[PDB]
Design a protein that fits this description.
Two copies of one chain form a homodimer. With about 450 residues, chain A is of the alpha+beta class. The first copy, chain A, has 17 helices and 16 strands. In chain A, the strands form three sheets. An eight-stranded mixed β-sheet of chain A has the order 1-5-6-11-10-9-7-8. A five-stranded mixed β-sheet of chain A has the order 13-12-14-15-16. Chain A has a three-stranded antiparallel β-sheet with strand order 2-4-3. Chains A and B meet through helix 1, strand 1, strand 2, strand 3 and helix 4 of A and helix 1, strand 1, strand 2, strand 3 and helix 4 of B. It is classed as ligase.
């Protein structure tokens, strides 16, 4: 019939890409478990009502909905159907949706099971999610998320452990990284002290440009964004920050005299930073950055963002502390902190840096001389496989050139010739396709 | 708000179940690669048209459809909408569907890429699929399939290799199995010789009961199913089969004199069976079973079915040879053969036999005495993690009983006490919660 195609926004993964993806995931999994995080897997389907309202005022549009089986029009509100109100009909013809992130199903799991879990509860979750988001360059409608969360405590030792988790994970992947850290209460202190409430994004976006466009350029952008000169001048010290991150925090805390939330944010960040230095962490790799402002409506304490050093790439991870995991499900007092790894971007970074290990092909292809001789190849192949060596018999007694061409295209490093002579003599003849060298040895030497 | 729940037909997987599932998959993956099979992953979404018409006349109902994003009523056929013809509207409000099996996406991949692939092409695929199938006890709407296929050759050495693949895979899982084998041409020979065309299922279902209900009971069921006594008497020899499977095939081939398809089916099966014996395979573990009749409309040659010995369980795998992978996509001459592993049933069998290995918890929990002492625990924890040993600090300076209770509930085998004395003395005190024994050793002995 007609020629097929991929659904928009998806792709196939062949052997090399699968193996590199699994390498990343297996490295992260192993690191998670050294840190006491246990895996959790939730279903690809959640109830529509579990996911709706969870992703912002205008986020329900981004969720993939599953059409009801059977006659899905069998119960539609008659007004809505004739009105063709697609939005109101969605809940009427669909009661299931695909996983959009990992945190909402995790909150459901905890809301459903918290009575039986042991707290503090550490879980990691590595699963595909699905997003109907507008066509953005570089992103796909299906992609893996990789999360670690611990819930049930507000202790700042958890922050310290997660910092070490990031550094060890990316060390194992071979990716040098710098972790930016801020704290939401510091931004709230800024808002209160300089009067920039509801202007934190514009302020920090501009201050973030200080190295590139200079102080005059930064101030001109803040003015254009409506930041008052009173605030710009009150925060002038943020234009002259010292080497020591700890000195910069000490300066903020003094300015936050009388602004208790700001004092608290500084104190919490000073805890994490100073413990990290005691643990050998480099203060150029873990950095206080007051312009980090991810998730202003979600994080209540620490905020993290991870970037690979020396690569033009977006962030490869972030996270932070939040007030209550299970708030939206009516279960109180489950505070938590989470981090994420950006796997597709990590993959792109590792690709650029040459970090993927060096393939799935048999080590030994046996030429197929004919039915009589091929059974003796099968015997040797089973012995190789018992010892953990991959091998296979070319399946037809084709011309040798065709068998050579196949080993060439599959990059198999050795072609094995086990003809009547080698069989009668209990030898085997191995043609190394890397060196071009050939030799005939006993089958006992070959299997040693 | 309201308390959440799982979508119907799904479940959460916690740590132990995830680790056992991954154990099965990693064992199979490793075995696949010893046999020269490379992984393939296709998207969770396929175009609706890719999947429709592929799963039988009444199979489209079993596919999960994804509702179009946006105003999905924006283009509906006006007659169909007012008619509320749900079935005709499906293609109008949905153009995507979830993966239903692995073979159709594999055929799409090959149809799309065959010009660039090297044949014979070996792939394995281990991915979740989604089925709206009616509520059957023991099955879930989301579950993993595990397939291996090789395409591009009709060689019966491929059958032989797949038999060995099954045996090695299940040996590694620790599951003793018997593999039933038949061949579709043998059943066609039966149909032609005894005149039982369109009665093969009823015949074989009844003959399958021979051990339990006896020959008189089998014949009475065949009569009730409309099998003629002429056929029952022509096939009387199938009621008196000898020990040697090879003798039973030789008898069939003689009776198939003049029935060329039957001769061919016997010849093809005799090849696979006799090569397998030469390779050391036990003829009680690989068995010719003329009543095996999976996939009568799909398999053209060998048919396999795998059962665990000594466990009341359904089949844990099956497969066989088919005519042309890419037939439905308009690409000819890609013959192939495939096998499948039933992972949920394999899991149930391994559970019954006690085959899962013996858990994700830290080896060492450090008690938290307070902020001053806790940093020294963090230092030791990092050293343990560098050596590959899992550990963590209890995150709050709680009462010891609470920290003991946590290690108890998490089954952590060791609690570590690193108080002011052990710190000043460069010692560590380890409480083994398995033996109840406690001891204080140097930190040098501990880290050795």
């Amino acid at each position: 019939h007609m020629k097929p195609s991929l659904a928009k926004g998806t792709r196939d993964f062949t052997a090399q890409e699968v193996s590199r993806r699994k390498y990343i995931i297996n490295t992260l999994q192993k690191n998670f478990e050294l840190f006491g995080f246990q895996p959790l897997e939730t279903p690809s389907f959640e109830n529509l009502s579990t996911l709706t309202g969870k992703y912002g005022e205008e986020g329900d549009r981004l969720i993939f909905k599953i059409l009801n089986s059977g006659n899905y029009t069998d119960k539609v509100n008659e007004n809505d159907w004739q009105n063709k109100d697609a939005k109101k009909l969605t809940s009427q013809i669909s009661d299931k949706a695909l996983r959009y992130d990992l945190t909402v199903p995790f909150a459901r799991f905890v809301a459903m099971n918290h009575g039986q879990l042991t707290f503090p509860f550490k879980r990691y979750q590595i699963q595909p999610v699905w997003r109907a988001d507008r066509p953005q360059k570089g992103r796909f409608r299906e992609f893996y998320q990789c999360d670690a969360d611990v819930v049930g405590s507000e202790s700042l030792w958890q922050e310290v452990e997660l910092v070490q988790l990031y550094f060890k994970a990316f060390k194992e992947l071979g990716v040098p990284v710098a972790i930016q850290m801020n704290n939401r209460k510091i931004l709230s202190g800024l808002a209160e002290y300089a009067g920039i409430t509801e202007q934190l994004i514009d302020f920090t976006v501009a201050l973030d440009k200080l190295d590139k466009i200079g102080k005059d350029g930064v101030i001109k952008e803040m003015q254009e964004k409506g930041i008052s000169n009173e605030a710009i001048e009150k925060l002038d010290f943020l234009f002259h920050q010292k080497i020591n991150a700890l000195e910069n925090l000490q300066e903020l805390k003094t300015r936050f005299e009388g602004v208790e939330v700001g004092i608290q944010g500084v104190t919490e960040l000073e805890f994490v930073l100073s413990k990290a230095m005691e643990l050998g962490i480099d203060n150029q790799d873990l950095v206080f950055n007051i312009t980090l402002a991810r998730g202003l409506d979600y994080y209540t304490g620490a905020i993290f963002e991870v970037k690979a050093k020396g690569v033009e790439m977006g962030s490869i991870g972030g996270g932070g502390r939040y007030n209550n995991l299970t708030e939206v499900f009516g279960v109180k007092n489950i505070p938590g902190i989470g981090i994420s790894f950006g796997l597709d971007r990590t993959y792109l970074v590792m690709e650029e840096l040459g970090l993927f290990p060096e393939t799935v092909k048999v080590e030994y292809l046996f030429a197929n001389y004919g039915e009589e001789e091929a059974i003796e190849a099968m015997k040797l192949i089973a012995q190789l496989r018992e010892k953990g060596i991959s091998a296979e018999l070319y399946p037809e007694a084709a011309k040798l050139k065709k068998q050579f061409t196949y080993a060439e295209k599959k990059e198999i490093p050795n072609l094995v010739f086990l003809g009547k002579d080698e069989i009668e003599n209990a030898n085997v003849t191995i043609k190394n396709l890397t060196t071009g060298e050939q030799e005939t040895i006993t089958q006992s030497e070959f299997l040693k």
